[PDB]
Design a protein around this ligand. Structure first.
Ligand SMILES: Nc1ncnc2c1ncn2[C@@H]1O[C@H](COP(=O)(O)OP(=O)(O)OP(=O)(O)O)[C@@H](O)[C@H]1O
Length: 368
């Protein structure tokens, strides 16, 4: 039963990966026992070369797969943003996206099997696969982030097959096309690279419809690059119910992404409050309980539970908000209702509650 361990090698490190592979395995044998991350090590070679060793889904002998990676520090071809993968900009993006249904797992597995099928030359006339992915759902769901985070994950997890990755994010809002796709082809010519091309909000092309010619040229250019073994095409759409030309039939991986449920919201807020405690904007630090812990005490209210119960109740009246709004509310909370360097978590929860109420007042104003 395989167990994945992501090893973040320092940018300033010049050690061979084989040496890091040997150290990290020796460390894992020391401890020998859920998801856990190391940021400090007794051993100096690890201190010197590794920023984190993180175990991702209590046991010892499993088949253990390490993925050692080194963030490419400098970020960005216009109209296109370009990142070498793994990119320092996308570090932690994956974990920042909380979904209900374990969408991220399936999404990774689908594209994994797609790349495996590409790589072994499975006749697509006999088993259905292709290099196009469509994330659709309402705005603010994390679709674009999830594409970038998926590209990063795939690159980190397929280091054995590809030495590095590439992400080109075409901005829907925009001859010159042929120059930008010349650039992308030159990246693809390096078969050590796994190249991702991301077309944000594809519905914008059929909505923005000279504009006829610009669209048909991008289609023919996409059709040209999806012919290559090391290409994945990522697309998103904010109109989920509407069929679309022509990425709908274009995509053997379609995936709905919807707004967070009250459970997901709770985990989302927890990740925000943890960060504020880490940075000590919330002080002093208090323990917060998970929903599972609350459920184990029957949601009795006491000193351990009171504030976590209050957060749970804030999560419930946040239902309806998108994740974009949700990760923005702690900033609004702090800016509108604290406006001081430091606040107890009692005071912040109460600030966040007001902010939430303020969102729906604005919503109701947009209605009338
Ligand atoms: N499920 C979620 N959990 C945590 N944060 C989220 C979630 N969904 C959205 N967000 C926050 O909102 C930010 C922006 O979302 P993003 O713009 O990727 O969503 P989108 O509107 O679906 O994408 P686009 O409109 O560009 O196609 C994310 O980086 C994330 O911080």
């Amino acid at each position: 039963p395989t167990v994945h361990v992501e090893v973040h090698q320092r940018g300033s490190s010049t050690a061979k990966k084989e040496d890091i592979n040997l150290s990290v395995r020796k460390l894992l044998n020391r401890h020998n026992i859920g998801d856990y991350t190391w940021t400090e090590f007794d051993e100096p070679f690890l201190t010197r070369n590794v920023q984190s060793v993180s175990i991702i889904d209590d046991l010892s002998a499993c088949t253990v797969a390490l993925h050692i990676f080194q963030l490419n520090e400098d970020g960005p071809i216009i109209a296109a943003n370009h990142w070498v993968l793994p990119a320092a900009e996308f570090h932690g993006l994956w974990d920042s996206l909380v979904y209900d249904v374990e969408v991220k797992s399936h999404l990774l597995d689908y594209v994994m099997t797609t790349l495996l099928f590409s790589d072994k030359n499975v006749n697509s006339n006999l088993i259905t696969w292709n290099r196009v992915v469509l994330l659709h759902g309402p705005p603010g769901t994390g679709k674009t982030s999830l594409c970038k985070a998926l590209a990063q994950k795939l690159t980190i997890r397929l280091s054995s097959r590809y030495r590095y990755g590439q992400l080109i994010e075409i901005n829907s809002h925009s001859k010159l096309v042929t120059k930008m796709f010349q650039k992308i082809q030159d990246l693809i010519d390096d078969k050590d690279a796994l190249v991702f091309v991301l077309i944000d909000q594809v519905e914008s092309l059929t909505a923005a419809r000279d504009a006829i010619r610009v669209v048909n040229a991008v289609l023919t250019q996409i059709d040209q690059i999806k012919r290559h073994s090391n290409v994945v095409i990522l697309t998103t759409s904010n109109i989920t119910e509407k069929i679309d030309v022509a990425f709908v039939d274009r995509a053997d991986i379609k995936q709905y992404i919807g707004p967070p449920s009250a459970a997901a919201i709770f985990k989302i807020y927890l990740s925000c409050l943890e960060e504020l405690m880490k940075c000590q904007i919330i002080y002093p630090r208090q323990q917060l309980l998970t929903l599972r812990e609350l459920e184990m005490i029957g949601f009795i209210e006491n000193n351990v539970s009171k504030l976590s119960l209050l957060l749970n109740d804030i999560s419930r009246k946040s239902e309806g908000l998108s994740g974009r709004v949700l990760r923005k509310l702690p900033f609004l909370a702090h800016a509108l209702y604290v406006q001081a360097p430091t606040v107890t978590i009692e005071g912040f929860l109460q600030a966040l509650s007001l902010a939430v109420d303020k969102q729906f007042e604005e919503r109701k104003k947009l209605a009338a």
